[PDB]
From a paper:
Within this class of proteins, the bromodomain and extraterminal domain (BET) family contains four members that are transcriptional coregulators and that recognize acetyllysines (AcKs) using a tandem pair of highly homologous bromodomains (BDs). Despite heavy academic and industry investment in this area, the generation of paralog-selective inhibitors has proved elusive because of the extremely high sequence similarity between the bromodomains of family members (90 to 95% within the acetyllysine-binding pocket residues). Using the highly conserved BET BDs as a model system, we conducted three mRNA display-based RaPID (random nonstandard peptides integrated discovery) screens using a single library (which contains >1012 unique members). Crystal structures of 13 distinct peptide–bromodomain complexes revealed highly diverse structures and binding modes among the cyclic peptide ligands.
Likewise, the most abundant family identified in the BRD3-[name] selection (BRD3-[name] family 3, accounting for 53% of total sequencing reads recovered for the top 500 peptides, including 3.2C) was not found in the BRD3-BD1 screen. On the other hand, the family to which 3.2B belongs was identified in the BRD3-BD1 screen with a relatively high abundance (BRD3-[name] family 2, accounting for 8% of total sequencing reads recovered for the top 500 peptides from the BRD3-[name] selection and 19% from the BRD3-BD1 selection; SI Appendix, Figs. S9B and S10). Cyclic peptide 3.2B showed strong binding but relatively little specificity, consistent with the abundance of related peptides found in the BRD3-BD1 selection; interactions with each of the six BDs had affinities in the range of ∼10 to 30 nM. Strikingly, 3.2B forms a single, well-defined α-helix in both structures; this helix contacts the AcK-binding surface of the two BDs with a very similar overall geometry and places its single AcK (AcK7) into the canonical binding pocket. It is notable that the AcK side chain enters the pocket at a similar diagonal angle to that observed for AcK5 in the peptide 3.1B binding to the “second” copy of [name]-BD1. Because of this insertion angle, the hydrogen bond made by 3.2B with the pocket Asn is again mediated by a water molecule.
Author numbering:
A (entry chain A): 351 to 459
B (entry chain B): 1 to 12
């Protein structure tokens, strides 16, 4: 429970304006219809975004911090899987993931 | 100006 509160604080900093320049592509779900990504649902079977993770934290859907971190890493894996390696959104994903992994590892135990 | 517009221009 106390580590779940840390997961909410980690996601809060991931939403903070300090990281917005590279974290914004992951704020909301990938709208496959509006963005014209007509192959996304064939490649990505389990989409995930920061807003969905936030709603699952508010609904207390995550049992522990490890399940929360799995959804965060699923969001990044979807980006690494769908986009080319040299794509600009891949570099932005590594930036935000480095912020997550550091704070997720530094979580009080 | 929206998230969707920026998102669209970033991917494509
Ligand atoms: N693009």
């Amino acid at each position: 429970s106390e580590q779940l509160k840390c997961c909410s604080g980690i996601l809060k900093e991931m939403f903070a304006k300090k990281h917005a320049a590279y974290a914004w592509p992951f704020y909301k779900p990938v709208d496959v219809e509006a963005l014209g990504l007509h192959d996304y649902c064939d490649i990505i079977k389990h989409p995930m975004d920061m807003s969905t993770i936030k709603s699952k934290l508010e609904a207390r859907e995550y049992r522990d911090a490890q399940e929360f971190g799995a959804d965060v890493r699923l969001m990044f894996s979807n980006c690494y899987k769908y986009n080319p390696p040299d794509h600009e959104v891949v570099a932005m994903a590594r930036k935000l993931q480095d912020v997550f992994e550091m704070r997720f590892a530094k979580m009080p135990d | 100006w929206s998230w969707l517009c920026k998102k669209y221009n970033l991917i494509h």
